[PDB]
Every structure is written in C-alpha cells, then in structure tokens.
Write a protein that binds this ligand. Structure first.
Ligand code: 1MV
Ligand code: 1MV
Lengths: 341, 341
C-alpha cells in the first residue's frame, strides 16, 4: 500500500497535533480543560486505520509537483489529514451517544466511560473545533485557507443532514419499512458518509495543490460519491455475510432496524407473503428471529445480487475514472478503488 | 430602548433566514431533513429577547457611516445578528441535554419533547452549521467574510472550553468546594458566557463596519469581558435574592452544586464552622436545606457585598469605557452598560 508507506509519518505527527492544541500555555486558568481536551483527542482520534486522513496525504503527493513538497507543505498535508480524522471523531463520539452504542472498535465508547456520560457532547464539539484551530495554526497564510475552512464546514453540514435523514428513516423503536426505499437509502449514504469519507479528503488535497476550479471539483465529486455509495453497500453486505473472522465483529444491522442495502433489496424483491415475514422479524433482539431474516435474504439470493452489483459497480467506477479524472492523474482515484474493491 | 426600535425588523427577518435555509429546493431527496431543520430552528431560536443578536444590529448602526447603510448592508446585519442567536441556540440545546434540564424559558427543552431525545445532539449541531451557511449566502463577497467565520469559530471554541471547565468544576453529583475558587469562577464566566455574549456581537459589528485592527478589538474585548463578568455575577445574585416576580423563575443554583459567585464569596468569608455547614447543605434537593444556605449567605451580608460590588464594577466599567472605547463612539458600550446595570 502507498498507505503503509506514509502511515508511520502520519501517526507520529499526531504527537505534534496534540502538543500544539495544548501549548494555550499562556493561559494557565484553563489548564484543566486543556488536559481534558488532550484525553478526548487521544481516546477518540487514535485507534483506527486512518484511511480518510492518509488519503489526504497520498493524494497530496500525487497532485503537487514534487519540487513543491518542501518539509512545511507536508507538515500541512499531515495536519489536514489529521483534520479529517478529527472531523470523523466528532461524528462518531456524537453518533455513539445518539445510538446508545456500547463499544467502538471493541473499545468502550467514550460517553460510556465512568465520569464522562453526556459531557461527551461538549467533548465531541471540542473535536470539531480543533479542526479550525489547526487550520488556522498551520494554513492561515496559504491561498487555500478559506477553501479548506468552507470544505470542512460544508462536510459537517452534509453529514449532519444525512444523519437527520437516517434518524427520521430508521428510528430505533419504530418498525416502518415503507420508509426504506432505494432513493432514501442512496440519499442517506451520500450525505451521511460519502461526502466526508471520499470527497472531502481528495478535495482537501486538491485545494492544497492549488486545484480549486469548480468543475474539477464537481468531476472528482461525481467519481468519489459513487465510490462512497459502493463502499457503504459493501459494508451492509459484509455486516451480515462477511466471514466474521476475515471482517471484524458480527453484524447487528437487522437487530437495529437499519436502512441497510440488504433490507432495501429484499423489499423490492418480495412476494406479499415475504413482506409480512419481514415486518414480523425485522428489528428484533432474538437470535433465531435474526437467523430467520438471514435465511429470507439467502433464499432471495441477495448474495448473488450483491456479487452482480459489485461487478457492475466496478465497471461503472472505471468508466467514471476514464471520463472524469482528467486532468488529475488517474491513480488518485485508482488507489482508492483498489482499497475498496 | 434603541433595542425596541430595531426589534420588530429583527424578528421579522427570521422568516427570511428560515426560507433561505430551507430553499436545498433543488435537492428533493433531503426534503424530510430540511423540514426537521425548520422545526428545530423555530422551536429553539425563537422565544427569548434577542439581546445578543440585536446588539449586532444596534452596534452596526452606530459604527457605520449612515450613507453606507444601504438595504443590503442591513439585510446582512440582521442576518449576522441571527447568526449570534443561532450560536446561542446550539449551546443551549446541547447544555440542556448535558444538565438534564426540564424546561428553558418555562418551555419544555427540545431534547425532552416526545420523539426527539438524544437526536437533539444532531439538531444542535445543525443549528451551528446554519451559521456558516448564512454567512456564506449573505456575506461571501464581503471583505469581512473570513473575519466573521473565524470569529464565530473562535466563539464556539471559547464557549466549549468554558463549558469543559464548568463541567470539571461542578460535576452534578460531587460536592467539592475546594474547586470553587475566585480564579476558577472568573475563568468559567469569561470563556463560557462573556466572549459569545458580549464580545462576539460587538466584534461582528466592528468587522462589518470595516474595523478590523487587532488593537481595536483587544480594546473592545477588555471592556466587554468585564461587562460579561458583571452580568453573570448579577445573574448569580438574582438567582437567589432576585425578587422572583420582577425576575423570572425561582433559582436552583445551590441545589445544583453550581459554581456561583455567591458560594465563591461565602467560602472566602467563612469561619471553619461555616465551611462545614456549607459542605453539609450545599447541593441538596431539600427546600429547608436550601433555605438554610440562603440564611448563611444572608448572615454573611453577601447582599451588601453584592451591592458594594455592583457600584465598584459600575465605576470600573465607566473608567474602562473612558480609556478603551476610542475611536469607537462611547455609546456602543454605554447602551450595553445601561441594559445590564
Ligand atoms: C477514503 C477511504 C479509503 C479507504 C477506506 C477503507 C476502509 C476499509 C476498511 N474499513 C474497516 P477497518 O480497517 O476495520 O476500519 P471499517 O472499520 O471502516 O468497517 N476495511 C477494509 N478496507 C477498507 S478500505 C475508507 C475510506
Ligand atoms: C449583549 C447583551 C445585551 C443585553 C443582555 C441582557 C439580558 C437581560 C436579561 N436577560 C434575562 P431575559 O430577558 O428574561 O432573557 P435572562 O433570560 O438572560 O436571565 N434580563 C434583564 N436584562 C437583560 S440585559 C444580554 C446580552
């Protein structure tokens, strides 16, 4: 991976991110808050694979004439990559509280730690605020400063809108399948995950590289939102049919009344007898009642529909790279495609 | 009031704010989210006196040569005033959840409405996001655009930091009076309320007027943070000794283990017998155990200490206006002083 090359340099820069967000050394009065902020950063922004933030860095290598990769330019790319990870950490701390999740990456969610609770709401907002403090501290003089601020702000808004739509669509506690439509599913994915996950990191790299034209961004967006769509559809598939060792942790999507790609397809493909069997069994705790939905999906050959979808989507993404990548190097999109397929 | 003059024009502009944040008319997919956003705006940003947002407008009249008050400049001042109110609504929706409050302005807190609950966390973040959407929609071309974005972002961070400090200082459930010190109290007030309440609206007016020098801002800040300090100390006093009719709703500060100005003074002024009587009775539900703290304050003549403090603070604020207002018209600060004293 072009990712395992930049990784150590990215994780090591985190120490600097933290030092600089804590050192408010002129103001001793707020010392205790700043220590809490340190703890929030370290618990919530560390632990994952850093795919989104690393993408900022990789794409920045690929886009900027290598003679303009002076030590400070890369300082800035590492920082902006960390900004994407902090935005992510803000979303997830807050989502975990809204979902009443227990763990995140097999670790206890921050709001469930003894003594944190709902104070995590302020902590989450502090994660988000750290983004603009870093952008100012590192990128204030740069011609892309305002472009980046607007990008991060816009990425928050799109994600929050998507979250609202998700929350209206699948309220934990209300089995209503009439809400689970293909259009709604696509819409949730695009706003809630694809913009920040796929558009944001590439677009940030673009602006840092001086590539600020609206059409270029619109062109990169069209490719990258499609990738985000596929990426989430594959997550929904693996959640149930992923070999749970190769994958991670067993999936709870059906139990949670999620607007999964699977239930969406199931509903489109269903005798009126089938819809009832789903109305009855979907969103339940009972293992044998989730084993029964798994069998209704298997019986509808949705794994084959998925495999069929994964191939079609792969050709489509390549047609899109062909058509919309220029004048960015196609490898910017292709590295991403390779990681997700 | 120079405030009751601009008020109707400010409240009426809210309809436009809302129309423009809802009309995402090109994107029908997100219709349901946008309707939820409308409901969140209307429930949480309407209902108070609009003192902070109005200040933006009043100060903008006083600061800009009246020949530069074309209909669009005032559109923008009304919008930026509404931005300050939305920032406030973000803080309060989120604080109410963190405090487990029941009502806000005798009305049911948004997170306690049937069907909202912890989804209010996303709603709060949407309130905050609306600020930057309005700034973009109305002020994108203006030379003060970036200055305003940074001001709002900085005001969020200061407030969030203050909130952390508050939460560490007075955890509901942990009677620890060793944390309640004058320095800590002042620090909480300055970060948590004074910056957004007093500095922010004037500073926004300043930038819109073209007054962007760092020293001018530092000068206005020094006056305005002092006013914010007094304003909060007066709130803590009225909370207990306010005639509850003239004031509003009876005060629960002692019950809630708050870092009130009153307990801070009480602790400084206390035989070691007194400290025990406070250690025992502070933070309790029982009416007769809150009636007992009220009597320990009365017995220490803290109402006289307050009256003494209010006079000293009034002279100090006037000395500060004299010294630091120039070259802004002293009336910018004096209108505020008149409203709070
Ligand atoms: C921009 C960008 C680039 C790559 C990714 C990928 C995430 C991911 C992935 N994610 C897994 P993880 O590696 O266990 O985090 P998940 O935790 O998101 O369910 N697992 C396997 N391959 C990939 S590729 C996500 C976003
Ligand atoms: C910038 C600025 C300007 C004026 C104020 C004032 C708020 C306020 C006030 N606030 C009362 P309210 O009028 O009942 O909102 P509170 O709800 O804040 O406890 N009550 C009486 N006078 C004043 S002056 C606050 C901030």
């Amino acid at each position: 991976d072009v990712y395992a090359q930049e990784k150590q340099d990215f994780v090591q820069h985190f120490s600097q991110i933290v030092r600089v967000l804590t050192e408010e050394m002129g103001h001793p009065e707020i010392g205790d808050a700043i220590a809490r902020l340190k703890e929030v950063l370290e618990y919530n922004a560390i632990g994952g694979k850093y795919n989104r933030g690393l993408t900022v860095v990789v794409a920045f290598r690929e886009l900027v004439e290598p003679r303009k990769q002076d030590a400070d330019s890369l300082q800035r790319a590492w920082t902006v990559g960390w900004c994407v990870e902090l935005l992510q950490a803000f979303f997830l701390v807050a989502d975990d509280i809204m979902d009443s999740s227990l763990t995140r990456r097999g670790q206890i969610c921050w709001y469930q730690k003894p003594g944190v609770g709902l104070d995590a709401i302020n902590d989450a907002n502090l994660l988000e605020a750290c983004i603009y403090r870093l952008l100012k501290l590192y990128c204030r003089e740069q011609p892309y400063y305002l472009n980046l601020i607007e990008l991060f702000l816009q990425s928050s808004y799109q994600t929050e809108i998507g979250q609202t739509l998700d929350l209206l669509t699948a309220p934990q506690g209300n089995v209503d399948l009439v809400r689970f439509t293909e259009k709604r599913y696509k819409s949730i994915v695009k706003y809630k995950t694809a913009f920040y996950s796929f558009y944001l990191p590439i677009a940030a790299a673009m602006y840092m590289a001086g590539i600020d034209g609206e059409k270029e961004h619109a062109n990169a967006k069209k490719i990258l939102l499609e990738m985000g769509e596929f990426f989430q559809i594959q997550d929904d598939y693996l959640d149930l049919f992923g070999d749970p060792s190769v994958t991670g942790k067993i999936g709870t999507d059906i139990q949670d009344n999620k607007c999964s790609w699977l239930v969406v397809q199931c509903l489109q493909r269903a005798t009126p007898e089938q819809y009832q069997i789903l109305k009855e069994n979907y969103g339940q705790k009972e293992a044998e009642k989730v084993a029964r939905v798994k069998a209704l999906y298997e019986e509808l050959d949705l794994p084959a529909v998925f495999l069929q979808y994964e191939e079609d989507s792969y050709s489509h993404i390549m047609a899109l790279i062909e058509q919309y990548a220029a004048p960015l190097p196609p490898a910017v999109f292709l590295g991403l495609a390779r990681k997700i397929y």
